[PDB]
Amino acid sequence: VEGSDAEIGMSPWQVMLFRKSPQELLCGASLISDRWVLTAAHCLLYPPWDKNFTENDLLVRIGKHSRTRYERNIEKISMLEKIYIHPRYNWRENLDRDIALMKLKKPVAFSDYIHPVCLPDRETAASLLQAGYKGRVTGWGNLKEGQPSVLQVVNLPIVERPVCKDSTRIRITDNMFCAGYKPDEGKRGDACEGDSGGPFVMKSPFNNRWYQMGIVSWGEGCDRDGKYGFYTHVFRLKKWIQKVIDQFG
Amino acid sequence: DFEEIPEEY
Amino acid sequence: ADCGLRPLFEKKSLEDKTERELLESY
Ligand SMILES: COc1ccc(S(=O)(=O)N[C@@H](CC(=O)NCc2ccc(C#N)cc2)C(=O)N2CCC[C@H]2C(=O)NCc2ccc(C(=N)N)cc2)cc1Cl
Ligand code: NA
Numbered sequence: 232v233e234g235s236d237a238e239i240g241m242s243p244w245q246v247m248l249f250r251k252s253p254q255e256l257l258c259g260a261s262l263i264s265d266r267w268v269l270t271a272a273h274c275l276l277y278p279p280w281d282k283n284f285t286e287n288d289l290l291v292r293i294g295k296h297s298r299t300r301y302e303r304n305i306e307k308i309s310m311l312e313k314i315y316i317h318p319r320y321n322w323r324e325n326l327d328r329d330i331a332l333m334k335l336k337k338p339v340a341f342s343d344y345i346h347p348v349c350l351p352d353r354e355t356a357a358s359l360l361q362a363g364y365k366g367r368v369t370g371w372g373n374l375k376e377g378q379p380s381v382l383q384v385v386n387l388p389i390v391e392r393p394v395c396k397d398s399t400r401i402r403i404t405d406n407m408f409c410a411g412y413k414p415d416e417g418k419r420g421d422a423c424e425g426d427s428g429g430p431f432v433m434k435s436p437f438n439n440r441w442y443q444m445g446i447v448s449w450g451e452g453c454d455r456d457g458k459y460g461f462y463t464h465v466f467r468l469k470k471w472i473q474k475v476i477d478q479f480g
Numbered sequence: 481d482f483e484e485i486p487e488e489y
Numbered sequence: 490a491d492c493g494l495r496p497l498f499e500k501k502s503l504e505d506k507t508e509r510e511l512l513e514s515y
């Protein structure tokens with residue numbers, strides 16, 4: 232959107248998926264441990280557009296703020312060990328289960344600018360995933376449906392599932408939620424192309440920790456009136472996340 | 481649009 | 490175990506400019 236420049240260290244779990252040749256932003260992502268990065272499956276696999284990256288095709292840049300700059304002494308650049316896409320990711324109809332994990336080649340060193348986000352447990356999800364509760368999304372994507380100089384941030388309220396459904400002809404599932412302001416609410420903002428795979432986070436009032444509740448997934452344009460941004464429901468897919476991390480590292 | 485990263489990576 | 494606690498904010502008890510907006514909505 233319709234967002235603002237982030238503060239330094241405001242989103243130390245934000246990851247940029249970077250294309251090796253040619254050099255350019257591919258997607259957002261997030262750090263969930265010293266060796267695991269969470270993103271959207273469509274960032275990695277989208278057959279209608281001939282998108283199918285493999286490990287060696289990209290890089291993970293962590294600790295960033297500036298979009299284009301090489302941030303010497305601050306960012307870390309990691310290689311991909313292996314990519315895992317949800318086996319029931321539905322790229323043909325509606326991006327259901329739009330989620331992927333990426334294992335890093337070597338562990339990343341935490342710093343003031345690099346630090347993992349929490350993943351929700353069932354009670355924090357129950358507590359926080361309520362219509363009208365606001366979350367925050369971050370990314371280096373389009374500013375309108377140019378490109379920013381530094382990381383952008385917007386706070387957006389979760390929308391009731393009926394309103395989400397009535398706003399689109401797409402078949403929405405329990406593995407998605409939508410967020411954004413209604414026409415009448417005045418204020419606006421949204422994620423857009425380029426923010427894909429980045430996190431929708433919320434700050435628990437119970438333990439003052441940030442949790443990643445969503446992944447930027449899709450939308451009908453960007454910040455259009457009466458449309459909403461759609462997010463992968465991280466808690467709903469946690470069973471799969473754990474199994475992957477359990478069995479693969 | 482991107483500054484050249486270390487050739488190392 | 491320190492997930493979700495930002496070195497430059499929660500770890501030093503500093504708040505960012507808009508996190509209160511989130512709190513107020515909860
Ligand atoms: C397979 O599932 C799909 C496939 C396509 C669409 S879409 O609605 O077309 N959007 C597509 C993109 C597109 O064709 N838009 C052009 C467009 C412009 C105006 C209107 C209107 N009104 C509708 C469409 C999209 O988001 N996706 C197609 C494949 C991946 C995903 C995407 O690009 N995601 C990035 C993204 C992230 C966030 C937002 C947002 N606004 N919050 C938007 C896009 C939705 C689903 Cl769930
Ligand atoms: Na509908």
Ligand code: NA
Nearest residue numbers: 454455456458
């Ligand atoms: Na909108």
